[PDB]
Design a protein around this ligand. Structure first.
Ligand SMILES: Nc1ncnc2c1ncn2[C@@H]1O[C@H](COP(=O)(O)OP(=O)(O)O)[C@@H](O)[C@H]1O
Ligand SMILES: Nc1ncnc2c1ncn2[C@@H]1O[C@H](COP(=O)(O)OP(=O)(O)O)[C@@H](O)[C@H]1O
Ligand SMILES: [Mg+2]
Ligand SMILES: [Mg+2]
Lengths: 232, 229
């Protein structure tokens, strides 16, 4: 028995270690990309405007920024699961996230809607990762509405856990794309990282919850989150 | 359930491979164009100036990013096969036995007939067992209760064919290749990595996997593996 546990512990250790080394390699990819992004901006600025050199240098800079954001999200995904659990009231966390996105919503003329239920029970979760998830969903919704929209967030008690649903009024998603939407590296945006919903899924998986989506193209979309009241 | 954990770890390694190949593609298409732009700016700029040196620096940086992405890919590259002689009858039986209790409780019938004349192939038993377990679990999920699971093994050419047929719930034909793509799944819970592991192991061995499915009727998955790699 002593050796068998030593064994299972060793296989688990090998997977987490591979994750740690992968995070390091990703951090080292960020360094030449950041160098490339800076040097491509210099060349774009110094190059004669309007020409092919200027266009190519600016496109390459934009691509290097997109690549740094892709690599940061990849690091978030490859990193071993590390959750700082805490008892959190969801109303306060949701309000804080909404206040975090308020300026960008008002700039684009998008309404933030959320009603709080003080009856709502506290959940065992990592508040920073839940923020990173809510913000990713909010950003997706904002990009999709583009202007003149509304975001409705609600929280309710489902069995044991809670369901936070974020509904937008944007372009929606076709049923054909309704499955590749969570697939890594898939995006319909030229300045998009197709890893935001991958990160959302990973974080909600580490929390033992579920992410589901219901969308009608043009009408809008709704992302529903189930998070357990007790992590165990 | 320590088996379930080992399965999950294999799924995570396959996922890391996919993520790495994706970042590599996304990083590599621009790289060549950046290196050319660097070369044009450097030839245009006077020798020794700041634009010249910085252009060489940008080129070297693109080459270094290629080296680092190659490193990530090599790190997630799967270990070579532990090639050993395997009697597939014994393996299929052990695989079904690892599923015996869950199939029994969920009212699932396990049917296999062994051919004594079936040759023993050079393969990795643990990985083949992983492909079999993945196919079986997917099949049980396809039908919670009142189903039958049929496995057949046969010689074919210079190889062997194993077919897993289930009553299940069926998969439409409009989504056939996409079933093998990693992170692809038709259930709310669950990863989309099982058949990704299956395909990775089969292609590692040197064989092929094919699917047949009638909606509402059931699904058949066929594996061809070589006798000597
Ligand atoms: N609220 C939404 N409304 C419409 N489409 C959405 C929404 N959220 C996600 N999507 C779709 O999912 C794809 C993947 O999103 P994600 O993985 O977060 O990356 P990105 O936001 O960079 O595209 C988007 O390109 C888009 O097509
Ligand atoms: N034999 C089958 N019968 C019915 N549906 C299947 C079968 N095999 C795979 N599927 C569907 O395709 C998805 C892809 O399988 P897989 O990648 O293993 O995902 P999972 O880990 O959720 O089982 C499954 O989740 C299931 O929804
Ligand atoms: Mg996004
Ligand atoms: Mg599966």
């Amino acid at each position: 028995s002593r050796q068998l546990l030593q064994d299972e512990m060793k296989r688990k250790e090998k997977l987490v270690a591979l994750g740690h080394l992968a995070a390091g390699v990703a951090h080292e990819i960020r360094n030449p990309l950041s160098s490339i992004k800076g040097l491509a901006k210099y060349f774009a600025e110094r190059a004669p405007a309007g020409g092919e050199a200027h266009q190519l240098a600016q496109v390459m800079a934009k691509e290097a920024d997109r690549l740094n954001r892709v690599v940061s999200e990849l690091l978030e995904l490859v990193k071993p699961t590390h959750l700082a659990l805490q008892a959190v009231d969801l109303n306060t966390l949701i309000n804080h996230s909404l206040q975090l996105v308020s300026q960008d919503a008002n700039s684009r003329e998008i309404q933030l809607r959320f009603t709080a239920n003080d009856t709502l029970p506290e959940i065992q979760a990592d508040p920073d990762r839940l923020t990173q998830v809510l913000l990713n969903l909010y950003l997706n919704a904002i990009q999709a509405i583009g202007q003149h929209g509304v975001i409705s967030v609600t929280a309710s008690e489902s069995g044991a856990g809670v369901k936070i649903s974020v509904t937008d009024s944007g372009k929606g998603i076709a049923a054909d794309q309704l499955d590749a939407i969570f697939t890594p590296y898939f995006t319909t945006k030229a300045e998009g990282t197709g890893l935001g919903l991958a990160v959302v899924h990973n974080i909600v998986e580490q929390h033992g919850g579920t992410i589901q989506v219901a969308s009608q193209e043009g009408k809008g979309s709704t992302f529903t989150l189930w998070l357990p009241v007790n992590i165990t």
